[PDB]
Nucleic acid binder design. Structure first.
Lengths: 99, 203, 102, 204
RNA sequence: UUGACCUCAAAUCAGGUAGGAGUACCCGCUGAACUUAAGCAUAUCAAUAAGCGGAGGAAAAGAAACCAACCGGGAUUGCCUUAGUAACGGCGAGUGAAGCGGCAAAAGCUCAAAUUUGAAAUCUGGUACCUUCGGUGCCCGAGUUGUAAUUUGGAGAGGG
RNA sequence: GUUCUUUGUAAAGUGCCUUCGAAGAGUCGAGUUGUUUGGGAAUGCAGCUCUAAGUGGGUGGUAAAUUCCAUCUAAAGCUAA
RNA sequence: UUGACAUUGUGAAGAGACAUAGAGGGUGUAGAAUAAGUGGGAGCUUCGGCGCCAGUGAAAUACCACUACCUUUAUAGUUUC
């Protein structure tokens, strides 16, 4: 990591020789996979949308996304979830309704 | 890979097709016994992933349980304590509904070594689960390098104790700085630090 | 079209209209089991075939999809059920009968 | 990526049935409301010319009326202040200077309602001439908002090369995503259709 | 009309297994009062006694969704320390940890999620014989809503 | 120590190229109710409604929004002293 | 005891937003003349209709994209009472 060799600093520590080994899978437990891709899209088309998912696209197209992230944080938990969750929402909004 | 499809299928519970079947099944069990065994699991996916092999020595038991809270057993709300300890309605419980259904099937099926159940139904007055127990005396299973521990006397009444996942979740024997409330035995860790340990040589 | 766990059969027809292979729903999973020396099966695949019945095979593929493959995207917007009993058919249809065309 | 269809490439240099030059117009769709503070009122500097026949009336003097007649349309003076005060107005915009502050009161009575005058918030008064004539005959074009969520203007010509138009809509698309507030809605870059005067309009 | 299927029964059918005790000690749910505050209502005693459920020789716990912020360590138990401290609290009476460190102690793994598919190769029981904490031939059934083998992320498998 | 039968066209592991690598949901988390705690905008536990996701996700002891770093592998079981 | 949310579903009609393609309409005096209305424009076009430079006004017209407001004008699909 290359520190400073002293007590404090922007790199508070000692400068010792680096090693670095092989990579781990205890870092990809949430990966893409061709197996889970096939599976997860297939079931989104078979069941349809939930009650709030209809009224979700209606409050974006018609009003806003500051509005969707506002009621999605009330339907779920995080703003971080609203990020990727409402992000994924417009993925179907475009790649389907027009194109 | 049918299991993969069934798994993401049991996550689309807010869809039009799932609301359908959990509303059909929930009702038919309401006209049956409260305590009524099952000849086949309604969820092959959940059943097998917990631990379920199709054979002579694995019984399923459909269980319909009630909810609400736990009113204290006092004559007319009559308590006899201090204001803090004087309620009847905001009276919960220290165990989950999952763990409760197991307690009652272990009294009916006293001869089987209970394993684990799961969530299936629930509308308003009733919640549904379905547990799986094993045969501690059947020959085919009495052997087997997977379940030889079932015939050991140390598992008699796993729900009355909490050797189950739902019991080890309700108890809280996990790893964490927040889980250091009772990381090792409730009253055990209690009595431990709350005891005076003195040696012949007091230092 | 059987199997108590109907969720064990509702994903098969969709995977079929996605690859391009013929599918056919019979009215008996217990019969699909006796021709295979079992009790019940419900599932019946046909992979390797002989130079005996290959001709009668493509003709059948056509009749089959003629009914299911094509009207797939069709009844995907059509709801089943809602059939009243004798008491509700007559009383209720003789209601909309004698309020308009009597 | 922008290079398959036209937009400012080739495609629409054969779909034309006209023999005279036709100026194309870029039609956008940026989600915005009835507010004033949230929006774009900036101008994207186009590097290449629009070859627009939009005559001018720039009155200069000294070392400002020399590099006048070489890159624009017409050449005026401070005395030719009694030509555009009567009965003739076909011009689209004017241009003055600093040495033209004393002689800037005889040109404001005919350019108030329409606005073709030299102001404090309008691009016109500059001392070094030869530099802004590459942004007047090239048409810099101004961006404004009527009341809602859309914007249209003027880009280039449909008779120039494919690379002489791709460097003109590179800093015109960047100004319609940078000056525009985030006080807006979903994507500032959605629908993007483009037509000239008659022909079709391609989107990306 | 014969024959399967699913489902619910039936017996003094065949084979089994549950109960109370004991309760020193360990796992739970429920749960006080006195006491203190020189009064006394949050607070304390106490996350205590009784009460009811539950096993063992030990048990419980357990190979991290661990602790840190190190030149990172590294399951679980335990004694010493941390310390009467961080903390909490009519910031009242009072109550109250953990990480690290030392040491006895020291064991590792296996299931689902993969096409065994050129072969349900697997298992229950009846019966015969036998060298009997059991073996082998036959006849049924479980089970394909899935039994042997391969593989558990620290890897690993298919092709070569 | 002695001694019966070769278990066998039995399996596991080492070096190299390529494709992949499936890993637990009415669970997670949120508002709120009560209760427990050394735990303090909330430690855990149960209840209620809501209701996830896959270059994901839990945790980093002041919430929160914003751009990063770190660090593990839950919602399956077993194991002596 | 009272309000709310879950439980708690499958329709018709009356108001009711809104995707989406067409069609459509508004300043007086005046300029032939329907103006909150910008620019491209000397041509779209065998027809020659408007032109246009001209010109009265506060705003000048077709090839008209549309910065477009607006039509409870209707369609092809979802909505709260």
């Amino acid at each position: 990591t290359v520190k400073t060799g002293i007590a404090i600093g922007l790199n508070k520590g000692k400068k010792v020789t680096s090693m670095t080994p092989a990579p781990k899978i205890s870092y990809k437990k949430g990966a893409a996979s061709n197996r889970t891709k096939f599976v997860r899209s297939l079931v989104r088309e078979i069941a349809g949308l939930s009650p709030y998912e209809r009224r979700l696209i209606d409050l974006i197209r018609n009003s806003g996304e500051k509005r969707a992230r506002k009621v999605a944080k009330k339907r779920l938990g995080s703003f971080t979830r609203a990020k990727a969750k409402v992000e994924e929402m417009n993925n179907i909004i475009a790649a389907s309704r027009r194109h | 890979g049918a299991y993969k499809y069934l798994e993401e299928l049991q996550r689309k519970k807010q869809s039009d097709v799932l609301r359908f079947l959990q509303r059909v099944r929930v009702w038919e069990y309401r006209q049956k016994n409260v305590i009524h065994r099952a000849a086949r699991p309604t969820r092959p996916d959940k059943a097998r992933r917990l631990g379920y092999k199709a054979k002579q020595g694995f019984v399923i038991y459909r269980v319909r349980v009630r909810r609400g809270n736990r009113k204290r057993p006092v004559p007319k709300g009559a308590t006899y304590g201090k204001p803090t300890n004087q309620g009847v309605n905001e009276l919960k419980y220290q165990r989950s509904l999952r763990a409760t259904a197991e307690e009652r099937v272990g009294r009916r099926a006293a001869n089987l070594r209970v394993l684990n159940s799961y969530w299936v139904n629930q509308d308003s007055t009733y919640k549904y689960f379905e547990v799986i127990l094993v045969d501690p005396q059947h020959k085919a299973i009495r052997r087997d390098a997977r379940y030889n521990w079932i015939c050991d006397p140390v598992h008699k009444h796993r729900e009355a104790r909490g050797l189950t996942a739902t019991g080890k979740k309700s108890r809280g024997i996990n790893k964490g700085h927040k889980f250091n409330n009772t990381k090792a035995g409730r009253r055990k860790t209690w009595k431990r630090q709350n005891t005076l340990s003195l040696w012949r040589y007091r230092k | 079209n059987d199997v108590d766990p109907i969720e064990l059969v509702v994903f098969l027809p969709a995977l079929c209209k996605k690859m391009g292979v013929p599918y056919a729903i019979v009215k008996g999973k217990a019969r699909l089991g006796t021709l295979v020396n079992q009790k019940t099966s419900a599932v019946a695949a046909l992979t390797e075939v002989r130079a005996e019945d290959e001709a009668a095979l493509a003709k059948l593929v056509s009749t089959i999809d003629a009914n299911f493959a094509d009207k797939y995207d069709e009844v995907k917007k059509h709801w089943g059920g809602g059939i009243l009993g004798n008491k509700a058919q007559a009383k209720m249809d003789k209601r909309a009968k004698n309020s308009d065309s009597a | 990526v922008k290079e398959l269809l036209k937009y400012s490439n080739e495609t629409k240099k054969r779909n034309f049935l006209e023999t005279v030059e036709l100026q194309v117009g870029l039609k956008n769709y940026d989600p915005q409301r009835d507010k004033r503070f949230s929006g774009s009122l900036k101008l994207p500097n186009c590097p290449r010319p629009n070859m627009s026949i939009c005559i001018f009336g720039d009155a200069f003097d000294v070392d400002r009326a020399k590099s006048c007649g070489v890159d624009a349309m017409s050449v005026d003076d401070l005395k030719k202040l009694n030509k555009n005060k009567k009965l003739i107005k076909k011009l689209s915009k004017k241009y003055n200077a600093f040495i033209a502050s004393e002689v800037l009161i005889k040109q404001v009575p005919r350019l108030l309602g329409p606005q073709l005058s030299k102001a404090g918030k309008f691009p016109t008064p500059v001392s070094h001439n030869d530099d802004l004539y590459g942004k007047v005959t090239d048409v810099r074009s101004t961006i404004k908002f009527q009341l809602k969520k859309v914007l249209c203007l003027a880009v280039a010509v449909g008779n120039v090369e494919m690379e002489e138009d791709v460097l003109v809509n590179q800093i015109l698309m960047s100004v319609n995503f940078f000056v525009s507030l985030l006080k807006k809605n979903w994507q500032n870059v959605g629908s993007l259709v483009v037509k000239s005067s008659m022909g079709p309009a391609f989107r990306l």
